[PDB]
Amino acid sequence: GAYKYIQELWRKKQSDVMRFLLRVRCWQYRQLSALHRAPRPTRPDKARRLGYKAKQGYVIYRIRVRRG
Amino acid sequence: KIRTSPTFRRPKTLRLRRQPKYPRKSAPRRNKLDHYAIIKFPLTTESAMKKIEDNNTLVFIVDVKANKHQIKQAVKKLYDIDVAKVNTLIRPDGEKKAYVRLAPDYDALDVANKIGII
Amino acid sequence: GRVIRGQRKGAGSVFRAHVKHRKGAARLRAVDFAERHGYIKGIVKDIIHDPGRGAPLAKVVFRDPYRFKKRTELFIAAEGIHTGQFVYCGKKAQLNIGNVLPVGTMPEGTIVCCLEEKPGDRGKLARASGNYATVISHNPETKKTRVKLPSGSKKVISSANRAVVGVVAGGGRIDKPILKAGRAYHKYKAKRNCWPRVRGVAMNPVEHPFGGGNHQHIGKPSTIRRDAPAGRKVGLIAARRTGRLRGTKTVQ
Amino acid sequence: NPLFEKRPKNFGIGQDIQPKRDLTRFVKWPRYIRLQRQRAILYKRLKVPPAINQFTQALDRQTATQLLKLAHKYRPETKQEKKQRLLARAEKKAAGKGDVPTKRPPVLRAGVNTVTTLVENKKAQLVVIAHDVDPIELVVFLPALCRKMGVPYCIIKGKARLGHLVHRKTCTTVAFTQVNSEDKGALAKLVEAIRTNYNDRYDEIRRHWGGNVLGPKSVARIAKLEKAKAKELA
RNA sequence: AGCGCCGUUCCGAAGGGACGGGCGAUGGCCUCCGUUGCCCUCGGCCGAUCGAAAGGGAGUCGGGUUCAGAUCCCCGAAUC
RNA sequence: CUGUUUAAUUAAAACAAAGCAUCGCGAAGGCCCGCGGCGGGUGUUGACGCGAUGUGAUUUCUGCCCAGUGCUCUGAAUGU
RNA sequence: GGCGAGCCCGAGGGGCUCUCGCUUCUGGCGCCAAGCGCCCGCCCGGCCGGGCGCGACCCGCUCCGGGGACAGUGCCAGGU
Ligand SMILES: [Mg+2]
Ligand SMILES: [Mg+2]
Ligand SMILES: [Mg+2]
Ligand SMILES: [Mg+2]
Ligand SMILES: [Mg+2]
Ligand SMILES: [Mg+2]
Ligand SMILES: [Mg+2]
Ligand SMILES: [Mg+2]
Ligand SMILES: [Mg+2]
Ligand SMILES: [Mg+2]
Ligand SMILES: [Mg+2]
Ligand SMILES: [Mg+2]
Ligand SMILES: [Mg+2]
Ligand SMILES: [Mg+2]
Ligand SMILES: [Mg+2]
């Protein structure tokens, strides 16, 4: 289907089309709290290949840590 | 829609009243501090009998959890006599002693003769 | 091996400022439309003495241009103002003693005080008793203004920040000798616990780099560089030249 | 009538207090408002890649409504009538004893995976895409795939509007595969205008770079400077 | 890393209450009022809370009473 | 000078003191606290202020040495 | 918008270019709108009780300013 496309697109995360998205999302997450609830996963294919299923009972949290 | 003030506040939203589908406790507990549990036994000391005839007041050793209103209600329910006032004090041993003054129409001598103490 | 007195100052345990009887922070009024497109008039109720400070604090009541309420502010009372004198605050205010107005409008050589480093800093520079700053230059394009501060330094600042006109009241405050230790104690008791000031050569080497020895001497060059660690900077700190001065220093 | 006089209040600097104004431009919005607002300004300031500029450029209010009226005839079958037809099927099968009494009804296919598996096998007559998706990466690859496969693809405004026909809150893409004989002409009349708008201009869309637009407060000052410079040159 | 810590107004959608008006429902002798649900208008906390038996803090005095109580008990006279 | 000092071997010539000098800092700063944050003290502070030293009522005097050890300043002419 | 000031062309006027609105003798007061133009239900073409707009102009993509691809942050290296 399309998850293979999304995976092969996210693999090359240094191109411009992906770098712009990553920078915008990093800026957006910098303004939020250190720990919060994302209502839907930003990476659906990566969540599926980890064990996330689109049904009730599965929650996604976004959390930042200090680099270093 | 005009914003009269530059301060944004939380909009007053509707709050549902708590409507429990089932009670958390099946039956309400029985009031253990009943009229018979409020007072325990009167005092028969000489200082207590001195207040019987000279003051028209009785002395009762009651629970520490009982206040003046509960003492008055318990006395009225048990002996069917009127109460003027109640003076309570915590004895140095931990109990509570209450001097309950009867109304002028009642006499403490007959109440004492009716309930044990003479 | 022990923390020195100058190093224990930053802990803030007992060296905090005695801010109990302080009346209030000396700050100007907030910049708004009524200040950048005109002026407003206020009435000085009274001047009061702020403990731990030589400059008196004047209470000024203004009328709120948006709400029906009187706003009370505490300004630094410039020398030459009395209770009841109307004080004007704004851009096109008349140039008089007590009135505050942006530095970009006053002419050169104007003696002002209680100004701001940046537009909106609310009166930070030249706040001590008897000090003033001198406007010496102006720039219409790329708005800048050169001012000479009481330290002789010529600093370039913005042309939008404000400054009250006049010298701070209480000048010559240092012409009187303390004349005894009691008055110095009563003075510093309102400021902070920093008066006793025991010399470093009197104590032991444990509490100061200068203490010790059978003779009360220093033994080391008191001139210490800027790269010295904490607890080491004692005596003269990066003294480019020491000894009794000969004329004017003339250092930027 | 005898004494009905006017009280003109002076709302200047220090005559009277200011009345209540809109103040919507200066109100302190919450953090979730301030975050979701300046995101559009950031998207307009930054030089967006040419793979996002495909979106935010969709059909007008006429052709989009026409495509919606066309899709309203091939909507996915709801669960109520689905249960109805499944109950009627087992009855009419025992009644008539027929193999296939109901012809397969032509219906549009929903879902990005289904749309992709259809366009890869060249089974879709048309593709319509939404642009209100939050992760753009789930959609950036589709226009190039449709350009490579030669099928007509069109972008439209409103994933909820795309969604309502499919009876769901959010739907990304919809593929038209089978069309009735009497709607085939109406569909072919619009696939041409879609091809001349998206397919034939794919190179220009891929070479076009959007965004990079400064704010009006920064454009007014450069306009003042260029005016003052032109008045000095000539 | 963490038991947690710094921070107390800072980077917070941090006022759940009321004056009045309107709609709707209910109860008391439905004459008249008391409430409940909703709408409109208005309303800076100087941010929860703790922190003094010598600080601020309304209002009891006289006489008598016991082996041990007194501005507390009794009488009499007041007050918040 | 008044004052303080080693409770339990020292009350002093010791410490402190006003006074006299010198140094750093115009706040994206000076001197410090802190494992951590643009966290805290000075700071409800702004050079008549803050921070760090020496000497030690008043008067008069403050001599000569930058070689060495320290402090500071300069030019990508110039070595490592 | 001229209740205003203009450098100009010009017979009435025009805007190439512009200052911009109305608080400075006085220890007083100043808010929750007057008026105008419309829209409803009630007194036969009336009174009373209400609603909207102008008063108080329009449009917009950062609350307003000051720095800024620096300062600061993480890692590594060399001095002290
Ligand atoms: Mg869910
Ligand atoms: Mg000393
Ligand atoms: Mg010693
Ligand atoms: Mg040492
Ligand atoms: Mg020697
Ligand atoms: Mg308390
Ligand atoms: Mg008595
Ligand atoms: Mg006694
Ligand atoms: Mg001592
Ligand atoms: Mg001794
Ligand atoms: Mg600091
Ligand atoms: Mg001397
Ligand atoms: Mg000498
Ligand atoms: Mg030399
Ligand atoms: Mg800005």
Side-chain angles (χ1 to χ4, degrees):
Chain A
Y3 291 117
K4 188 69 174 302
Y5 287 80
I6 315 306
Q7 167 185 357
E8 285 258 18
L9 186 85
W10 263 89
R11 277 186 169 188
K12 37 192 60 178
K13 57 178 64 64
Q14 212 173 5
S15 86
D16 47 358
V17 58
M18 205 39 75
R19 178 172 50 184
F20 170 78
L21 262 69
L22 296 202
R23 188 174 56 190
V24 176
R25 287 170 186 173
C26 202
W27 171 90
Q28 178 177 356
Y29 302 156
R30 266 189 294 185
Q31 275 73 242
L32 286 164
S33 180
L35 184 150
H36 51 96
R37 178 186 182 183
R40 42 193 67 257
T42 317
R43 311 185 63 185
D45 54 280
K46 190 62 180 180
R48 293 279 276 173
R49 74 176 68 257
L50 285 178
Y52 170 79
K53 319 287 290 183
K55 59 181 180 181
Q56 300 176 352
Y58 289 7
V59 195
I60 304 298
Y61 284 172
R62 184 173 296 108
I63 48 183
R64 72 167 185 258
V65 304
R66 272 212 164 273
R67 147 175 294 190
Chain B
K1 307 306 174 59
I2 302 307
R3 290 294 178 85
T4 174
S5 199
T7 298
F8 190 92
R9 302 296 293 267
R10 188 183 72 253
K12 182 181 181 301
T13 187
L14 198 146
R15 294 175 175 177
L16 309 188
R17 188 61 60 91
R18 175 183 286 268
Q19 187 64 226
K21 188 174 300 303
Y22 69 100
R24 265 63 189 178
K25 273 161 211 63
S26 54
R29 61 176 181 271
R30 180 194 68 257
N31 186 26
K32 300 180 180 180
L33 209 65
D34 58 49
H35 299 281
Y36 297 102
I38 281 172
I39 76 171
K40 292 181 292 183
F41 54 94
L43 263 187
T44 307
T45 80
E46 52 280 0
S47 88
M49 304 273 136
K50 184 160 213 225
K51 312 292 290 298
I52 293 309
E53 59 204 9
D54 301 357
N55 202 10
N56 199 20
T57 186
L58 272 71
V59 177
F60 283 101
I61 290 178
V62 300
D63 293 8
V64 286
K65 301 185 182 62
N67 43 22
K68 299 177 181 301
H69 303 298
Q70 279 178 350
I71 291 173
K72 185 191 195 75
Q73 290 294 332
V75 168
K76 284 184 172 182
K77 287 289 295 183
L78 267 42
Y79 302 143
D80 314 288
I81 47 177
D82 262 348
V83 178
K85 54 179 179 179
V86 179
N87 303 118
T88 81
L89 66 95
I90 300 293
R91 311 169 49 85
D93 57 27
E95 291 134 359
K96 172 177 292 185
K97 174 173 54 181
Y99 302 84
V100 49
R101 180 173 183 175
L102 306 185
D105 67 329
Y106 288 107
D107 190 13
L109 268 299
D110 59 51
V111 188
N113 290 17
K114 187 46 202 73
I115 56 193
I117 43 193
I118 177 280
Chain C
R2 193 177 289 277
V3 192
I4 77 171
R5 181 189 67 251
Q7 195 176 357
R8 295 191 296 106
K9 286 284 181 59
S13 56
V14 309
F15 303 101
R16 289 200 191 101
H18 304 168
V19 67
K20 169 65 179 183
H21 295 296
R22 298 278 183 83
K23 295 299 170 295
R27 283 178 287 102
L28 297 187
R29 206 186 60 87
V31 176
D32 44 351
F33 184 86
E35 182 154 87
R36 60 177 303 171
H37 287 76
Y39 69 94
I40 58 183
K41 154 192 165 302
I43 309 105
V44 291
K45 295 290 188 60
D46 57 6
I47 62 178
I48 48 184
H49 158 75
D50 193 15
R53 181 186 313 179
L57 269 296
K59 269 200 252 193
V60 194
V61 167
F62 299 103
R63 191 167 57 92
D64 202 309
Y66 304 98
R67 268 71 64 97
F68 173 67
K69 207 169 65 61
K70 293 182 181 180
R71 299 292 184 174
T72 296
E73 307 285 342
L74 280 74
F75 294 169
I76 311 176
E79 184 181 331
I81 63 179
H82 56 97
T83 60
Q85 166 186 346
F86 296 147
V87 183
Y88 302 90
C89 303
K91 187 254 297 182
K92 48 169 49 59
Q94 303 286 278
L95 192 146
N96 278 327
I97 290 191
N99 296 330
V100 70
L101 57 96
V103 194
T105 54
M106 44 184 58
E108 280 86 14
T110 317
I111 298 314
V112 299
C113 80
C114 179
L115 63 90
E116 324 176 353
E117 297 177 348
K118 309 176 182 180
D121 193 11
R122 205 179 286 199
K124 282 305 180 181
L125 288 186
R127 294 175 59 177
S129 45
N131 285 117
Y132 56 89
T134 299
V135 192
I136 54 189
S137 159
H138 284 85
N139 282 325
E141 73 294 339
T142 79
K143 39 183 63 61
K144 291 296 174 183
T145 308
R146 195 179 296 270
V147 300
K148 185 184 64 59
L149 298 164
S151 45
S153 44
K154 295 156 180 298
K155 179 184 180 179
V156 52
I157 65 156
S158 159
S159 315
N161 51 8
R162 309 153 298 162
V164 311
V165 194
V167 174
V168 186
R173 191 265 308 277
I174 61 180
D175 311 331
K176 187 175 179 181
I178 314 288
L179 206 53
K180 59 185 185 178
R183 293 178 178 175
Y185 169 73
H186 289 308
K187 163 193 178 181
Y188 278 126
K189 186 180 179 180
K191 288 180 174 296
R192 64 199 68 86
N193 179 26
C194 78
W195 180 46
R197 194 69 181 183
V198 173
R199 290 174 293 114
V201 295
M203 54 193 67
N204 309 90
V206 180
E207 309 98 356
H208 206 272
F210 289 164
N214 291 116
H215 291 272
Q216 196 176 16
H217 61 75
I218 303 186
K220 320 169 187 57
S222 69
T223 44
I224 308 196
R225 71 196 187 280
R226 300 287 292 188
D227 303 358
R232 191 60 180 92
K233 292 185 179 182
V234 289
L236 311 185
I237 310 175
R240 61 193 66 196
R241 58 170 320 283
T242 181
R244 194 172 181 88
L245 308 163
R246 311 279 82 177
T248 309
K249 51 97 171 183
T250 302
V251 193
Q252 284 49 70
Chain D
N1 193 21
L3 55 95
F4 278 165
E5 52 83 13
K6 309 173 304 175
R7 284 86 60 85
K9 290 185 177 182
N10 197 338
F11 298 114
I13 293 93
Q15 287 73 241
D16 298 326
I17 70 164
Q18 299 297 327
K20 303 307 178 182
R21 289 190 174 92
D22 50 335
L23 294 184
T24 55
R25 196 255 187 273
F26 305 94
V27 70
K28 184 173 64 180
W29 292 104
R31 180 168 293 266
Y32 85 109
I33 302 291
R34 200 184 306 107
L35 190 44
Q36 78 164 355
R37 279 195 174 187
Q38 60 204 26
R39 187 170 56 190
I41 298 88
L42 263 193
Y43 271 114
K44 290 181 176 58
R45 294 286 206 281
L46 305 186
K47 305 189 298 179
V48 302
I52 312 178
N53 283 126
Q54 304 169 335
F55 317 96
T56 78
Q57 182 192 10
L59 321 172
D60 59 356
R61 277 84 182 271
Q62 195 264 344
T63 69
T65 45
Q66 208 281 333
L67 171 148
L68 258 69
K69 280 191 297 318
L70 179 58
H72 191 76
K73 302 180 179 180
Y74 304 101
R75 304 179 64 180
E77 190 213 352
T78 69
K79 293 191 175 184
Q80 187 82 20
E81 56 183 2
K82 202 255 185 173
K83 181 186 63 178
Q84 184 70 27
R85 72 161 290 189
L86 268 294
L87 172 140
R89 209 269 188 271
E91 272 312 326
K92 67 187 170 53
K93 164 74 69 176
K97 302 322 300 182
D99 189 350
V100 52
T102 78
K103 188 55 209 94
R104 193 63 167 90
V107 73
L108 54 89
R109 303 297 294 272
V112 57
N113 290 331
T114 77
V115 164
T116 44
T117 63
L118 287 169
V119 59
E120 210 283 333
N121 314 336
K122 309 269 211 62
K123 298 324 182 192
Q125 288 285 336
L126 187 139
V127 175
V128 55
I129 305 174
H131 88 274
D132 301 357
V133 178
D134 181 38
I136 305 310
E137 63 261 54
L138 320 184
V139 197
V140 289
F141 74 100
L142 192 44
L145 204 157
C146 315
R147 173 64 171 92
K148 271 192 171 300
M149 298 285 102
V151 299
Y153 75 102
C154 82
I155 317 176
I156 202 166
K157 304 165 84 177
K159 57 187 184 184
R161 196 177 54 159
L162 185 33
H164 195 263
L165 70 93
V166 189
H167 316 263
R168 284 149 186 83
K169 293 192 299 297
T170 315
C171 200
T172 299
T173 44
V174 161
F176 290 159
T177 55
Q178 188 189 9
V179 57
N180 289 322
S181 78
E182 57 90 19
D183 292 341
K184 185 175 302 180
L187 187 148
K189 194 45 75 163
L190 61 91
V191 303
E192 190 172 348
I194 290 184
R195 283 180 303 173
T196 73
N197 209 334
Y198 292 112
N199 290 120
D200 214 338
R201 213 166 43 86
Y202 176 78
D203 44 356
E204 292 196 346
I205 290 178
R206 191 179 59 189
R207 294 299 186 88
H208 178 67
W209 277 78
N212 201 21
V213 176
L214 283 83
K217 293 188 60 180
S218 200
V219 173
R221 50 189 301 170
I222 204 63
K224 296 255 188 175
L225 270 72
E226 70 92 9
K227 283 196 307 176
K229 173 211 69 52
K231 293 313 150 272
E232 200 167 29
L233 305 192

